Amino acid sequence: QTDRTGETALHLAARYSRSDAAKRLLEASADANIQDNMGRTPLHAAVSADAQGVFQILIRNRATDLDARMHDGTTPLILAARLAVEGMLEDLINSHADVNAVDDLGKSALHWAAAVNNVDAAVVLLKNGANKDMQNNREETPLFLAAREGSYETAKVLLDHFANRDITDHMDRLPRDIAQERMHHDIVRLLDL
């Protein structure tokens, strides 16, 4: 049963870090994948709440959909990269979440790590087979988004992984071009090295 935000008891257990409550619900065959009003499952809720105990319980539960999509296509892994929560991104990847899944705009977890300058997440994603040159629906690569947002440290990791700096967006702009337009002079310098 759902509340006014579409949350089940399991969503609430996640949001409030109630580990025993989570286990009893799952043992009673509570559906691990019910969506709230924004399409969040209890696993999205645990990532957003940084609820470590319930997070582990949910990823250890076989029937939990690790690649579940919010109503904008956001997965638990993309959410972990965006929010820069400790540990959870790597735990999801180790539990075999799809490193290359994308939201409804075509953005992977690596696109988002680049946009928010989550350098540690970019490193783990790349080490686990993330496509460094993936283009989203606007033809933007993670390097393009790092250059757009001024994410210097993540741009550097991407270049050290030999990300292709010549892949342009839908308007034929290079990462170097968007950095220049947005006055991210340190990135233009880095790209010119």
Curated annotation (Swiss-Prot):
Q: Where are the ANK repeats?
A: 5-34, 38-68, 72-101, 105-134, 138-167, 173-192
Which domain of life, per UniProt?
Eukaryota
Q: What are the boundaries of the region HIF1AN-binding? A: 25-33, 92-100
Q: Which residues carry this modification: (3S)-3-hydroxyasparagine?
A: 33, 100
**Which compartments does it reside in?**
Nucleus
UniProt protein name = Notch 1 intracellular domain
Q: Which organism is it from?
A: Homo sapiens (Human)
